[PDB]
Design a protein around this motif. Structure first.
Motif, mmCIF file in Angstrom:
data_model
loop_
_atom_site.group_PDB
_atom_site.id
_atom_site.type_symbol
_atom_site.label_atom_id
_atom_site.label_comp_id
_atom_site.label_asym_id
_atom_site.label_seq_id
_atom_site.Cartn_x
_atom_site.Cartn_y
_atom_site.Cartn_z
ATOM 1 N N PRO A 8 -91.784 -23.248 -68.699
ATOM 2 C CA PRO A 8 -93.154 -23.729 -68.897
ATOM 3 C C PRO A 8 -93.159 -25.006 -69.740
ATOM 4 O O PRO A 8 -92.117 -25.452 -70.205
ATOM 5 N N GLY A 9 -94.333 -25.577 -69.968
ATOM 6 C CA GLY A 9 -94.432 -26.816 -70.735
ATOM 7 C C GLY A 9 -94.391 -26.645 -72.245
ATOM 8 O O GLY A 9 -94.891 -27.485 -72.979
ATOM 9 N N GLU A 10 -93.782 -25.568 -72.705
ATOM 10 C CA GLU A 10 -93.684 -25.252 -74.137
ATOM 11 C C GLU A 10 -92.440 -25.891 -74.765
ATOM 12 O O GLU A 10 -91.869 -25.390 -75.722
ATOM 13 N N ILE A 11 -92.034 -27.028 -74.217
ATOM 14 C CA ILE A 11 -90.869 -27.749 -74.633
ATOM 15 C C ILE A 11 -91.064 -28.427 -75.990
ATOM 16 O O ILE A 11 -90.151 -28.973 -76.613
ATOM 17 N N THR A 12 -92.292 -28.351 -76.440
ATOM 18 C CA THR A 12 -92.724 -28.939 -77.709
ATOM 19 C C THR A 12 -93.565 -27.977 -78.537
ATOM 20 O O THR A 12 -94.789 -28.064 -78.584
ATOM 21 N N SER A 13 -92.873 -27.065 -79.190
ATOM 22 C CA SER A 13 -93.513 -26.006 -79.986
ATOM 23 C C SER A 13 -93.001 -25.913 -81.429
ATOM 24 O O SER A 13 -93.404 -25.032 -82.174
ATOM 25 N N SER A 14 -92.071 -26.796 -81.790
ATOM 26 C CA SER A 14 -91.404 -26.772 -83.115
ATOM 27 C C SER A 14 -90.974 -25.363 -83.587
ATOM 28 O O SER A 14 -91.280 -24.961 -84.716
ATOM 29 N N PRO A 15 -90.243 -24.602 -82.746
ATOM 30 C CA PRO A 15 -90.041 -23.189 -83.110
ATOM 31 C C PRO A 15 -89.080 -22.928 -84.253
ATOM 32 O O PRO A 15 -89.090 -21.866 -84.861
ATOM 33 N N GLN A 16 -88.228 -23.898 -84.532
ATOM 34 C CA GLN A 16 -87.210 -23.755 -85.570
ATOM 35 C C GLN A 16 -87.768 -23.990 -86.977
ATOM 36 O O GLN A 16 -87.022 -24.336 -87.878
ATOM 37 N N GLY A 17 -89.073 -23.827 -87.165
ATOM 38 C CA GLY A 17 -89.670 -24.024 -88.480
ATOM 39 C C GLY A 17 -89.592 -25.470 -88.931
ATOM 40 O O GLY A 17 -89.502 -25.756 -90.119
ATOM 41 N N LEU A 18 -89.606 -26.380 -87.968
ATOM 42 C CA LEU A 18 -89.469 -27.813 -88.251
ATOM 43 C C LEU A 18 -90.676 -28.323 -89.011
ATOM 44 O O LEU A 18 -90.576 -29.179 -89.882
ATOM 45 N N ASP A 19 -91.822 -27.782 -88.646
ATOM 46 C CA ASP A 19 -93.096 -28.160 -89.239
ATOM 47 C C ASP A 19 -93.345 -27.358 -90.513
ATOM 48 O O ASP A 19 -94.120 -27.757 -91.376
ATOM 49 N N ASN A 20 -92.646 -26.240 -90.648
ATOM 50 C CA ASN A 20 -92.776 -25.375 -91.807
ATOM 51 C C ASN A 20 -91.442 -25.141 -92.516
ATOM 52 O O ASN A 20 -90.852 -24.051 -92.418
ATOM 53 N N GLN A 89 -93.221 -18.461 -82.585
ATOM 54 C CA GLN A 89 -93.946 -18.018 -83.772
ATOM 55 C C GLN A 89 -94.556 -19.178 -84.566
ATOM 56 O O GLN A 89 -93.957 -20.239 -84.726
ATOM 57 N N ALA A 90 -95.739 -18.929 -85.106
ATOM 58 C CA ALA A 90 -96.449 -19.894 -85.932
ATOM 59 C C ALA A 90 -97.151 -19.111 -87.038
ATOM 60 O O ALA A 90 -97.273 -17.879 -86.949
ATOM 61 N N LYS A 91 -97.603 -19.806 -88.071
ATOM 62 C CA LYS A 91 -98.337 -19.191 -89.182
ATOM 63 C C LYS A 91 -99.371 -20.195 -89.650
ATOM 64 O O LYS A 91 -99.292 -21.366 -89.309
ATOM 65 N N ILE A 92 -100.302 -19.728 -90.460
ATOM 66 C CA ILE A 92 -101.297 -20.568 -91.094
ATOM 67 C C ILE A 92 -101.037 -20.278 -92.557
ATOM 68 O O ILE A 92 -101.024 -19.116 -92.960
ATOM 69 N N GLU A 93 -100.754 -21.313 -93.322
ATOM 70 C CA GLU A 93 -100.446 -21.173 -94.739
ATOM 71 C C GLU A 93 -101.555 -21.838 -95.546
ATOM 72 O O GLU A 93 -102.279 -22.692 -95.036
#
Length: 98
Positions: A8-20, A89-93
């Motif tokens: 799918p087009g989820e090639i850009t989801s930052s899953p490795q905690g890159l954003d967090n 996975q994602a979170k709101i901090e």
């Protein structure tokens, strides 16, 4: 066993905690295998983790992402359609501690 995976087009989801980096640091500290590969493959990001300081962990995380991106752009120009993060996975901090 024969297996397959979707693209799918989820090639850009930052899953490795890159954003967090806060969450990634936490997972790494809790994960002896991941922290070990990290010191083997990426000693400057690893030493930042070993020090505990989220500030240095995050600082080096961005520097490493810039360096990844410099070479990654050359590679993805050839091909790029392989996701691995179906859970994405994602979170709101928040920090409302006054």
């Amino acid at each position: 066993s024969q297996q397959s995976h979707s693209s799918p087009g989820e090639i850009t989801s930052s899953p490795q905690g890159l954003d967090n980096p806060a969450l990634l640091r936490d997972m790494l500290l809790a994960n002896p295998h991941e922290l070990s590969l990290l010191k083997e493959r990426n000693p400057p990001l690893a030493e930042a983790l070993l020090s505990g300081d989220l500030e240095k962990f995050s600082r080096v995380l961005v520097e490493q992402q810039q360096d990844r991106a410099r070479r990654e752009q050359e590679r993805i120009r050839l091909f790029s359609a392989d996701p691995f993060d179906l859970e994405a996975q994602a979170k709101i901090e928040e920090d409302i501690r006054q």
